Every structure is written in structure tokens, then in C-alpha cells.
């Protein structure tokens, strides 16, 4: 069975990741592919509720612990992800390990190396779209929500970390100009996605950061 592609959407807050993830799954299915949507954090599981509570500022969680929970929340969906991809379903994922390193990496005294480790070995994405746009334009998209990390200084430090993670060519990173219109951004991501789906069927699923 021809495997599906693992596609990840990354980017700062308000970059359009959730809107484009949804629209990408709808377009791929309308085009005859079997595609499904996933997101991280996956807030429906027991670890997911601890995470959701933390982000809603309803609870405080020690920073290394919260980093590890974000990773475990990915490992708990790995058996499903592998199962689906091997069945031929392409998965479109709104945030993944990159967000996990970039957001904890924005906290002082958290090295990029330490942050990466828990995620070493996850399914390696076939494509990582980075939805680029000036944090200034992003701010034009209404106001900041009330969740943890939803402020300018934190976003700025996470973008810097994302810039470090892009210097790793082992991954198929693709920059997307997220400043355009929802439909324009969508057309770009769809075209990149169709190309990746075609090629993923040729090489086995690899492991991240290893």
C-alpha cells in the first residue's frame, strides 16, 4: 500500500495555521486523496487537558514538566499516525515538534538541544510548511488571545528559535508567504502538498532528529 504523506504546518501565532490546515484537508479530499487533520497540542487526552489548563492559565506547571508533557502528547498519537500513513492516508498536522522546541526555547536557560531530545524519534514529516509573516502583520489580525505565550515578546523569541530549526536541512522545510489572502496562501500550500504526497509514496517514513 502506497503510504500517505505527513505534512506539518508551523509558524507564529495568527500565521493562519489552523485556517490553512483545515482548508488543505478539504482541498486534498475534494481532489480524491484520503487526507485527515491532526493538531498539537491534542487537548482531548488526559495529558491534553493538563496542557489546555496550563495554556488557559488555569494551572501553573513547572517548565521542564510542561515541555515533556507537550512531547508525550505527540508520542501518544504515534501508533495512530503510523497506522494511518501506512494505510495510505495523508495527515495534515497543525503544529508539531518544531513548535514544541520553539516555544520552550523562548524561555531562558532552555537549550535547543535539550528541547529537541524528547521528540527525537517521532515520525519525520515529509513536508514542513512554515507560514511566514511579520509579527507586525500578524498583530493586525485582530488582538492577542488570552492564552499563555500570546504576547509579543514571547512570540518574538519563539520566531528566533524557529529560525534556528530551519538551519537543519535534514528536513523538507518550505517557506510560505502567509501575508497573502486566505485563498492565495491556500493555493501555494496545496500545490506544495500535492507534490509532497506524490513523492512520499517513494521513500519510507523516517525518524525525526536522528
Ligand X SMILES: Nc1ncnc2c1ncn2[C@@H]1O[C@H](COP(=O)(O)OP(=O)(O)O)[C@@H](O)[C@H]1O
Ligand Y SMILES: Cc1cn([C@H]2C[C@H](N=[N+]=[N-])[C@@H](COP(=O)(O)O)O2)c(=O)[nH]c1=O
Binding residues: 14-19, 95, 180, 190
Choose among 116, 144, 140: nearest CA to 13: 144
Strand (E) or helix (H) holding 160? helix 152-166
Choose among 45, 39, 40, 43: nearest CA to 25: 39
Binding mask 101-120 for ligand X (x = CB under 6 A): --------------------
Query: Which residues of the shown chain bind ligand Y in the complex (CB under 6 A)?
Result: 13, 40-41, 55, 70, 94-95, 99-100, 103, 149-150
Binding mask 152-191 for ligand X (x = CB under 6 A): -----------------------------xx--x------
Q: Which does 53 bind (CB under 5 to 8 A by kind): ligand X, ligand Y, Mg ion, none?
A: none
- We find the least distance from the C-beta atom of residue 116 to ligand X, in angstroms, to be 22
For strand 35-39 and strand 90-94, is the pairing parallel, antiparallel, or unpaired? parallel
**Cα–Cα distance measured from residue 159 to residue 168, given in angstroms and rounded to the nearest whole number:** 15
**Cα–Cα distance measured from residue 100 to residue 196, given in angstroms and rounded to the nearest whole number:** 23
Q: Which does 182 bind (CB under 5 to 8 A by kind): ligand X, ligand Y, Mg ion, none?
A: ligand X
* Residues of each annotated binding site for ATP: 14-19, 95, 180, 190
The C-alpha cell that represents 59 in the structure block:
494551572
Choice between 11 and 100, CB closer to ligand X = 11
Choose among 4, 7, 3: nearest CA to 171: 7
Instruction: Count CA atoms within 13 Å of residue 144 on its CB side.
Output: 13
Q: Which does 173 bind (CB under 5 to 8 A by kind): ligand X, a second copy, ligand Y, none?
A: none
> If binding is defined by CB under 8 A, does position 89 make contact with a second copy?
no
Question: Concatenated DSSP letters for 131-142?
Answer: EE--HHHHHTSS
Q: Tell me the sheet residues that pair with 10.
A: 130
Q: Which does 181 bind (CB under 5 to 8 A by kind): ligand X, ligand Y, Mg ion, none?
A: ligand X
Q: What is the DSSP letter of 177?
A: E
> If binding is defined by CB under 8 A, does position 46 make contact with a second copy?
yes
> If binding is defined by CB under 5 A, does position 18 make contact with Mg ion?
yes
**Binding stretches for a second copy (CB under 8 A):** 46-47, 50, 61-62, 64-66, 68-69, 71-73, 75-76, 78-79, 114, 117-118, 120-121
Amino acid at each position: 500500500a502506497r503510504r500517505g504523506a505527513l505534512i506539518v504546518l508551523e509558524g507564529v501565532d495568527r500565521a493562519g495555521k489552523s485556517t490553512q490546515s483545515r482548508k488543505l484537508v478539504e482541498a486534498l479530499c475534494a481532489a480524491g486523496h484520503r487526507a485527515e487533520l491532526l493538531r498539537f497540542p491534542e487537548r482531548s487526552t488526559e495529558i491534553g487537558k493538563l496542557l489546555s489548563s496550563y495554556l488557559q492559565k488555569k494551572s501553573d506547571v513547572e517548565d521542564h514538566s510542561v515541555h515533556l508533557l507537550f512531547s508525550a502528547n505527540r508520542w501518544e498519537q504515534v501508533p495512530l499516525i503510523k497506522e494511518k500513513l501506512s494505510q495510505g492516508v495523508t495527515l495534515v498536522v497543525d503544529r508539531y515538534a518544531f513548535s514544541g522546541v520553539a516555544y520552550t526555547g523562548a524561555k531562558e536557560n532552555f537549550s535547543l538541544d535539550w528541547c529537541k531530545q524528547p521528540d527525537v524519534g517521532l515520525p519525520k514529516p515529509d513536508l514542513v510548511l512554515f507560514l511566514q509573516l511579520q509579527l507586525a502583520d500578524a498583530a493586525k489580525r485582530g488582538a492577542f488571545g488570552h492564552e499563555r505565550y500570546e504576547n509579543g515578546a514571547f512570540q518574538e523569541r519563539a520566531l528566533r528559535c524557529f529560525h534556528q530549526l530551519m538551519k537543519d536541512t535534514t528536513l523538507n522545510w518550505k517557506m510560505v508567504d502567509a501575508s497573502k489572502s486566505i485563498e492565495a496562501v491556500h493555493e501555494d500550500i496545496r500545490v506544495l502538498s500535492e507534490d509532497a504526497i506524490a513523492t512520499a509514496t517513494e521513500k519510507p517514513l523516517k525518524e525525526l532528529w536522528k
